[PDB]
Structures are given as C-alpha cells and as structure tokens.
Amino acid sequence: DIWPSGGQMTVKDLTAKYTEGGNAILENISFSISPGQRVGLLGRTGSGKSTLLSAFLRLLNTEGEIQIDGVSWDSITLEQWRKAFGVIPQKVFIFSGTFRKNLDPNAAHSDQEIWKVADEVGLRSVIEQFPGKLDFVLVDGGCVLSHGHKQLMCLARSVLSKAKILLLDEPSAHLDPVTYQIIRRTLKQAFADCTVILCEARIEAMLECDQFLVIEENKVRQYDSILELYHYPADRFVAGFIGSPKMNFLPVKVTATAIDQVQVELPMPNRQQVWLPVESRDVQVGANMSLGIRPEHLLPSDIADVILEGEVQVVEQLGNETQIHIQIPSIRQNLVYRQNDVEEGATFAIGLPPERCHLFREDGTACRRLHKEPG
Ligand SMILES: O=P(O)(O)OP(=O)(O)OP(=O)(O)OC[C@H]1O[C@@H](n2cnc3c(NCCc4ccccc4)ncnc32)[C@H](O)[C@@H]1O
Missing domain, CATH: 2.40.50.100 (RNA polymerase II/Efflux pump adaptor protein, barrel-sandwich hybrid domain)
Structure with a gap:
C-alpha cells in the first residue's frame, strides 16, 4: 500500500499551541485540499502561517484531525507521517556519514536511483568533485556544502522518499537565486502531480495557484481562484494583496x-x-x-453617473499601463486611477x-x- 497516493488533505478543527499550557495561535481550523493542488498561503503579519506548516509536521502541541489520503495522523509514527511531506526551506540535518547515507538513510535505493534524483535536482556535479563521490564522507555537519547544496539534499531526500505534499515556507526569501530556480524546476518536473502549499509575502511569485488559503482571526477562508481573490476579498487585507497599484x-x-x-x-x-x-x-x-x-475599475468622466474631479499630482508612465494619481479637493484625499497602455497639474475627472x-x-x-x- 503505497502512501501517499494523490496528495489530498483534510483538516478538522485544528488547534496548534506551542506550549502545553501556553496560548493557542490557531483556535479551531477546518479545510480540505484536493490532490495535486497548488495552494497559496496568506495572512497578516503574525497570523500563524508558519505555525500551520509546523502543525502539519506535528512539531508542536496539536489538537484535532489531519488526514492525507484518508489516513489519520494518530495511527502513524511521526517520522512516517513526515515522510509524506517535502519541506523546503528546512532546518537541514546532515547526518554523520557519506553522501549516499545522507540521501538514502534507509539504504532502500540503488546507486543508479540515487544518481538519477541527484542529476534532476542538480547535485551530480556537487557530489562528483569529492574523491569518493557517493562514498565521500561529509564531516562537521556537511561544512563542504553551501546553504543551497544542503537544501538540494533535503529536496533530493524527498524526491527519493516520494513525498506528495510540499510545504514551501517562503522559498524565494530564504534561498539562493540559483538554488531557488532548481526548486521551481523540479516542482513542475518531479512533483508535477503533487499538492504544493506555497507561502509567500508577494502575490507576484504565487501567480500560479489553483487555490488560496487565507488565515482570518478565528477561521480560514479558502478562495477557489485568483479571480475569486481579486473580485471577492472577504477582508481588507486580501483586497490590498492582489492588484497593483493598491x-x-x-x-x-x-x-x-x-x-x-x-x-x-x-x-x-x-x-x-x-x-x-x-x-x-x-x-x-x-x-x-x-x-x-x-x-x-475607475471609469473616465464622460462615462459614469457618480463623477469626481481633481488636479493630477503624478502621471506615472510605465509603458504597458499609465498610473494617474489625482488629488481630489472634493474628497479630502487622493484617488489613484489606472488604464492599460496628459501631464501633471491639469484637471482630471473620474467616474466611480x-x-x-x-x-x-x-x-x-x-x-x-x-x-x-x-x-
Ligand atoms: O512570519 P510572519 O511574521 O509573516 O507571520 P506568520 O507566519 O503568520 O506567523 P508565525 O511565524 O506562525 O507566528 C505566529 C505566532 O506564533 C507564536 N510563535 C511562533 N513561533 C513560536 C515559537 N517558536 C519556538 C521554536 C519552535 C518550536 C516548534 C516549531 C517551530 C519552532 N515559540 C513560541 N511561540 C511561537 C508567536 O506568538 C507568533 O506571533
């Protein structure tokens, strides 16, 4: 029975607390992710994004039900449950021993198998420079490896372990540009049919998500698309997150x-x-x-019924769009107008x-x- 199979995950009233008698960062959380879904994780500064990912791995005191492919997290060992996930960036553990062991801790893989995964994650050349290749002993926590090399080994470990759910805790933030790209490359290659939970600070590098998951105060709302997130933000934070200018x-x-x-x-x-x-x-x-x-969405003057007027403070020319910052005297504030593909000062008029x-x-x-x- 090869587990996991697809990558589907269901959550029922999850409570994540750091101390047994501390304070619950996530009160009662329920959601469900379909198999092979790339999910963007969102939330205000401190809401509990990283805590969710930590609760998936059961790295803190957790209450409730988490299920991947119809299997509860209570009838399986931590290390077996964690083998289902591929977590990068990760607190890198480089074990005492050789390249082979660090990639294949269970000794459950052929050398040809290991080289295949090494090659597809860009480790072939990294391993080869060292005398014994796979036989080369990694001393002092793997001090011959760069930060990126160590992450690629965590990744390779997961590809070899055949993980099905990936937890990207701000990869673009905590990775080398050269490493980060390989991670995105193997993501569409090796983990093509896998659940991916991309958590980042900017929507620019989340533009390819089928689904989103936003952490409210007590609940977690989930948006079925970019369009949903754009047109129907359930809070003021989500409204500012998508679309530029704000x-x-x-x-x-x-x-x-x-x-x-x-x-x-x-x-x-x-x-x-x-x-x-x-x-x-x-x-x-x-x-x-x-x-x-x-x-x-702001209309030109001649068009609407509700009209506003003001003097232009900023005309930003970008080429593929034109941003007009209008200082409206009627309303005591500025109003940013935009249109696809007029100088400062002159009176503009916008319809709402x-x-x-x-x-x-x-x-x-x-x-x-x-x-x-x-x-
Ligand atoms: O990253 P951001 O800023 O965008 O926000 P976010 O991702 O939504 O927020 P989180 O990083 O989830 O932080 C959410 C809250 O959880 C608490 N908190 C977080 N880490 C805490 C901690 N760590 C000790 C070591 C540890 C133990 C187990 C697992 C991981 C780390 N020990 C104790 N309380 C910890 C703390 O009150 C935080 O305000």
Whole structure:
C-alpha cells in the first residue's frame, strides 16, 4: 500500500499551541485540499502561517484531525507521517556519514536511483568533485556544502522518499537565486502531480495557484481562484494583496440599508448618495465604513453617473499601463486611477461605478459583493 497516493488533505478543527499550557495561535481550523493542488498561503503579519506548516509536521502541541489520503495522523509514527511531506526551506540535518547515507538513510535505493534524483535536482556535479563521490564522507555537519547544496539534499531526500505534499515556507526569501530556480524546476518536473502549499509575502511569485488559503482571526477562508481573490476579498487585507497599484479606500457613512444592498455617502463636502450591490447583513445605518475601489475599475468622466474631479499630482508612465494619481479637493484625499497602455497639474475627472465597489467595516471585514463578475 503505497502512501501517499494523490496528495489530498483534510483538516478538522485544528488547534496548534506551542506550549502545553501556553496560548493557542490557531483556535479551531477546518479545510480540505484536493490532490495535486497548488495552494497559496496568506495572512497578516503574525497570523500563524508558519505555525500551520509546523502543525502539519506535528512539531508542536496539536489538537484535532489531519488526514492525507484518508489516513489519520494518530495511527502513524511521526517520522512516517513526515515522510509524506517535502519541506523546503528546512532546518537541514546532515547526518554523520557519506553522501549516499545522507540521501538514502534507509539504504532502500540503488546507486543508479540515487544518481538519477541527484542529476534532476542538480547535485551530480556537487557530489562528483569529492574523491569518493557517493562514498565521500561529509564531516562537521556537511561544512563542504553551501546553504543551497544542503537544501538540494533535503529536496533530493524527498524526491527519493516520494513525498506528495510540499510545504514551501517562503522559498524565494530564504534561498539562493540559483538554488531557488532548481526548486521551481523540479516542482513542475518531479512533483508535477503533487499538492504544493506555497507561502509567500508577494502575490507576484504565487501567480500560479489553483487555490488560496487565507488565515482570518478565528477561521480560514479558502478562495477557489485568483479571480475569486481579486473580485471577492472577504477582508481588507486580501483586497490590498492582489492588484497593483493598491485598491483605493474611501471613508464612508451608511445612509441606508436594504435587503441585498447598502447605501453610503462620500466623506466630502459634496457627500453624494450611492447604492451598492453588496450584502446588507450586519450593517447598521449610520456606521462608519471603508469603500474599496480599484484603480483598474475607475471609469473616465464622460462615462459614469457618480463623477469626481481633481488636479493630477503624478502621471506615472510605465509603458504597458499609465498610473494617474489625482488629488481630489472634493474628497479630502487622493484617488489613484489606472488604464492599460496628459501631464501633471491639469484637471482630471473620474467616474466611480457602484457595481464594482467593495465595502469594508471598521474591523476590516467585507460585506459580500453580489455583482457577478464573469469568470
Ligand atoms: O512570519 P510572519 O511574521 O509573516 O507571520 P506568520 O507566519 O503568520 O506567523 P508565525 O511565524 O506562525 O507566528 C505566529 C505566532 O506564533 C507564536 N510563535 C511562533 N513561533 C513560536 C515559537 N517558536 C519556538 C521554536 C519552535 C518550536 C516548534 C516549531 C517551530 C519552532 N515559540 C513560541 N511561540 C511561537 C508567536 O506568538 C507568533 O506571533
């Protein structure tokens, strides 16, 4: 019975605590990942991203149920459970002995097998320089190896162990550029049909994810696509994460609610009234809100019904896009406008489309957008 098989993982009310009598960083967490899914892990500074990955490996006091391919984490040994995962970057353990042993601790592999994995992870040349090749003894914690060499050995170890779930704890951050690329290369090659949990600080190097997993305060929401994350951020953090330049935020007051709508007024001496195709639940009339609108979605003057005007402070020419920073006097703040593929000072005018406005409460959470964006 070859385990793991696909890479599917289910989580039921997970509680991760560092000390037996400490404080729980993750209260009660449930989710499920389909086999062979590349999942982006997101969260605010300190929310518990690294802790989740540490809880997967059971490296702290853990309560609840984790299951890979319908097998619980309670009827299997730590080292067997950890063999299912390929963790890089990793606290590198280089064992006392030879290259062969460090790659194949169980002695369960042919020398030809070891060389094959070594070659595909770029270790062939690293091993060859040393007298005994595979027979060469690695002294003093593997002090002849660079940081990257050591990570490639952890990786090779996992390819050889045939791991099925990969835990990338900010790889681009903690790796050599030359090492990091090989990791991405073997990711689409050796671990092509594997669950990958990419955790990083920038969406630029997460652009290829089928799924996302964002850590809230108590729950973990999961977005089925980049499109979902872009159009329907369930909080103000997620709204700022995707799309550049950042989403414009406007302070607004709720003048009215409805059944499936919310009305707000602009913060300005112009204080205009506008309805928003946004969920009405948990919205008290009079409350303070933050209206979100992307620079991408802002219409030109001649187009919309709700119009704004101001003097241009910055015209940023990038070639494939043009960024217009408009200092609007009506509203006491700037408004960044954008359009695909006009100098500083002159009066610009932008239209704000109610259909594509996000709405955020004081706490940060978003009122669900009801407008159905195609795709
Ligand atoms: O990396 P960021 O900044 O983007 O944020 P994040 O990834 O969402 O946050 P995490 O790094 O998960 O940190 C989340 C909280 O968990 C606590 N915490 C984290 N590490 C802690 C620790 N480590 C001791 C050694 C150890 C033990 C077992 C496993 C790994 C490390 N011993 C005790 N408390 C530890 C601490 O209160 C942190 O504020």
